[PDB]
Design a protein around this ligand. Structure first.
Ligand code: HEM
Ligand SMILES: COc1ccc(C(=O)O)cc1OC
Ligand SMILES: [Cl-]
Length: 393
């Protein structure tokens, strides 16, 4: 028997305060049934990790949102990487892994670090800043669009385009329906910027299209792989950076430990991703009957994974509700796990590291000062506004 719960993990009240409900989702049993959306879920670390690491049984090609692509019309042409299974997934995964490789990070890191330091020096001249608009948003906007090779015009569609894609994985509630009603101009902008003549030489977009020249991908595939990096590669990092600043603001003792040893910057950022889990949820679909958490689940069934919950599961983590910058974070599922584990995770950790390193070296205190406003999204957790006072070192 699978326990039934009435929790709506896509409701505003849940977004505004998820922790008691995530606890209940964990503690009711290892597999739950959600009355509201008629779907199975798993919220503990063990099950979430086991599902992520069995892609044959728990496939992605039937979509990683609620909608079942075998049954329902995808709201947009499916991603070649996120919404595919091996073997079809492998060649596009290989292309983006090479585009976003450690050797590539080396070539862009000095520029990203200089931007992060200049950003923090500029914020400290104002003192009173919005850690979202002026920092979690402004910093990735200053490095990632340039790193892709994108033109200047139309960049203001990037954040709302990614908000839409993330809302569209969710159930058919008002967040999802309003995003889709308003999607056309964001998609028209992104479609144009995926085309080879619009991507500057040297940048990720141009590097992707160079795979057509060796026959590694077709001219039709290349724009869809650019589209992947424009769907996933900005808002995620905005929310991960926003999480880490919010964590440093709420846990003054951790900011002081970071200031004592700035080489903690990389792990301080990793722990922010665990702690807040910017991407909260993803689904899979069963490919056969499977025993999961002691329950037998039939073939063809959607399963919701609570990544944010797995990252706070006390069966896996000591004091999961504390932000601890020296925590051993290895194994958290905030970037996923297994064959689809975040292919952009080195870009995200580069931005995260260099930014917290700048904060480590330059800032003595971060005090929230003003109303904190949350942004609601079906898949993304993060704030809309986070007014803070920064005190220089
Ligand atoms: C803190 C920031 C980030 C977080 C929390 C995050 C989270 C995730 C998660 C949970 C998945 C696994 C999806 C699944 O299992 O279905 C994923 C995959 C993916 N991520 Fe990220 N990501 C971040 C940054 C980025 C960046 C900066 C890029 C690109 C530059 C990117 C590109 C992708 C792509 C294309 C996939 C699909 C990979 C595959 O299916 O093999 N991500 N990410
Ligand atoms: C991690 O989130 C994503 C990953 C890949 C893609 C993709 O479009 O391939 C989209 C995502 O959501 C906006
Ligand atoms: Cl699109």
């Amino acid at each position: 028997t699978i326990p039934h719960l009435a929790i709506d993990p896509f409701s505003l009240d849940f977004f505004d305060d998820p922790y008691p409900d995530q606890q209940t989702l964990r503690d009711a049993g290892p597999v739950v049934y959600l009355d509201k959306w008629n779907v199975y879920g798993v919220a503990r670390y063990a099950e979430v990790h086991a599902v992520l690491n069995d892609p044959t049984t728990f496939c992605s090609s039937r979509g990683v949102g609620l909608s079942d692509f075998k049954k329902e019309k995808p709201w947009r042409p499916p991603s070649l990487i996120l919404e595919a299974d091996p073997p079809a997934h492998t060649r596009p995964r290989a292309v983006l892994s090479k585009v976003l490789s450690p050797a590539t990070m080396k070539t862009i890191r000095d520029g990203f670090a200089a931007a992060a330091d200049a950003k923090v020096d500029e914020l400290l001249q104002r003192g009173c800043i919005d850690a979202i608009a002026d920092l979690a948003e402004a910093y990735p906007l200053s490095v990632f669009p340039d790193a892709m090779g994108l033109k200047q015009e139309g960049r203001e569609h990037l954040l709302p385009y990614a908000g839409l894609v993330f809302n569209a994985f969710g159930p058919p509630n008002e967040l999802r329906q309003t995003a889709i009603e308003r999607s056309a101009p964001h998609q028209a902008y992104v479609n144009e910027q995926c085309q080879r003549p619009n991507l500057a030489p040297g940048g990720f977009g141009a590097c992707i299209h160079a795979f057509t020249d060796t026959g590694e991908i077709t001219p039709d595939e290349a724009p869809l792989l650019v589209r992947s990096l424009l769907s996933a590669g900005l808002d995620t990092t905005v929310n991960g950076i926003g999480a880490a600043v919010y964590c440093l603001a709420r846990f003054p003792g951790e900011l002081q430990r970071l200031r004592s040893d700035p080489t903690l910057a990389r792990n301080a950022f990793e722990e922010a991703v665990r702690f807040e889990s910017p991407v909260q949820t993803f689904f899979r679909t069963t490919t056969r009957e499977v025993e999961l958490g002691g329950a037998v689940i039939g073939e063809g069934e959607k399963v919701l994974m609570f990544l944010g919950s797995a990252n706070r599961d006390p069966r896996r983590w000591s004091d999961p509700d504390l932000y601890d910058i020296t925590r051993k974070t290895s194994g958290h599922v905030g970037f996923g796990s297994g064959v689809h584990m975040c292919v952009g995770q080195l870009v995200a950790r580069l931005e995260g590291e260099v930014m917290l390193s700048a904060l480590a070296r330059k800032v003595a205190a971060i005090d929230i000062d003003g109303p904190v406003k949350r942004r609601f999204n079906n898949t993304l957790r993060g704030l809309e506004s986070l007014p803070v006072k920064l005190t220089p070192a």
